[PDB]
Amino acid sequence: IFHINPRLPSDLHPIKVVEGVKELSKKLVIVNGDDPLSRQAQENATLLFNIHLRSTLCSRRMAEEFRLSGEAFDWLLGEIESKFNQAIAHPGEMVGALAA
Amino acid sequence: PYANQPTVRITELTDENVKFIIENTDLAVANSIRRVFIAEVPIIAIDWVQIDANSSVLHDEFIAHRLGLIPLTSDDIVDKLQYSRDCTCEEFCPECSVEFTLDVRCNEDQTRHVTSRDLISNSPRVIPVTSRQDDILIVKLRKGQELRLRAYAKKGFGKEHAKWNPTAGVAFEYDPDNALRHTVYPKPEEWPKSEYSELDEDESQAPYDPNGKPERFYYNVESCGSLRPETIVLSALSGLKKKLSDLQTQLSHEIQSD
């Protein structure tokens, strides 16, 4: 979309990757709340996706493999959160009928 | 930016079929002509059957159906008659139909064959083909069985019902040697030569002709006898030209009315 050309040196600062992913981990909320029991369960419920997110959006893979610009990275983070929030189970979903 | 100049050669012309070749022209024109031969040349066929007495072993719809398929010698009168849907008269009239009568009773032991020879027209020019060989069998009757009915034939397209299709089979072929490779034989040697193949018996198919176009179209228009086989073609060209003229009229009205 932003026509990266992974052959020129990129302008995406490494710590903008680090802190962008940190901030993104905040917006992918499964268990809402500030209670310790709820921060714990939010951390558990989004633990594998957060590991995946931190393992593909690394400072290095962004530098050496994806070569995303800053604009591309901002877009990327917004896309990740906008898609994750669509993945959340809708309340009201007759999931046991689905399981059967 | 304009039309091509088609040209024609008749290679054979019988009272059953025409073989002819159209050159130049275009594949779409040649195929649409083929279609008009099949589906939009008008002929006269039985399309109304008032059965007064039937005691044959065939039920009335079966009799009526068979009468439908009997071809009629409408070589001229089809261009005179209106479509009945368009004629302004409350019943059938001799200007939009030909009446037929069938009145046969098997008053003898020998199994009477009712045939097209028993369809009596009200018009000596619209008669079943086999009346002008053997006649088309409509029913075999046992002693004491009878079939009295009167029918009307009317003009119709082969497009409406197949009874009005004038052709027995339109052969249509182009590029007999596959120079265009529009067909792509997996094994070009298993395929016999076309009737019109120009190749020797050595080579299988013509060398690919990249800039080529399909430009000779080989026809065999076999009639069912309802029209003479050359009249099928002339009538299809007239019909297609008339369809296009009508389309153009409606177009000009839609353009000027915008």
């Binding site: 809402n32 709340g33 929030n85 669509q86 959340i88 809708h90 309340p91 009201g92 979903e93 | -």
Partner: protein, 78 residues
């Protein structure tokens, strides 16, 4: 202190659209400009996109509490 999801679930969207389209069909005043359509479901859908549907959604929690959510407050998904 509403704790439920701020997104209009697809069930709430189906029910809200059908209910609002019913109200429109019963000659309720429309909350959006009609550019010239007449189906009550198309109008209800436009109102949903304009976030002008005059309906609030009472979401019951399993404890039997409830939360009321306008149809302009929560984030419509499709």
């Amino acid at each position: 202190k509403r704790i439920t999801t701020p997104y209009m679930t697809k069930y709430e969207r189906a029910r809200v659209l059908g209910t609002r389209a019913l109200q429109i069909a019963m000659c309720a005043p429309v909350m959006v400009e009609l550019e010239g359509e007449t189906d009550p479901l198309l109008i209800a859908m436009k109102e949903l996109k304009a976030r002008k549907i005059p309906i609030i959604i009472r979401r019951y929690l399993p404890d039997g509490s409830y939360e009321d959510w306008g149809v302009d407050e929560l984030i419509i998904s499709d």
